[PDB]
Amino acid sequence: MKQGGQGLQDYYLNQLRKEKILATVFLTNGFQLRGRVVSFDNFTVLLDVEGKQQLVFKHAISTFSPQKNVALN
Template sequence: MPAKSINLQDTFLNQVRKENIGVTIHLVNGFQIKGNVKGFDNFTVVLDVMGKQQMVYKHAISTITPAKAVNFMSEKEEG
């Protein structure tokens, strides 16, 4: 049986979304956006920034920094 591949990007974004962890998104042009991830797909991330929605294209993102540590292990994987 083939091993299930883990998509770290989706896992990370889904955890910060579910746990409502604030993030700072650093863009390739030097700008920073602080908010909470509300959704994402293969090409975009939607943030809540001070009560307003903002969609950012992933190709414009350099780094995403969470306000606190993110647990990548799901409950199924932990035991």
């Protein structure tokens, strides 16, 4: 029921997506977006930032920092 090795990632981002939890996404270049997850695959995260879409490549992402903790397993 998952791809081996990315259970934390897929579960976590999927919880952020379902609940639409606001999060600060720190990028590797040090820039940052404060928005919500619309969608994601293995390489990209589609983000809702103040009503505007932002397609962010995962390799550019440093950290997801949610405003509310996600329930774990």
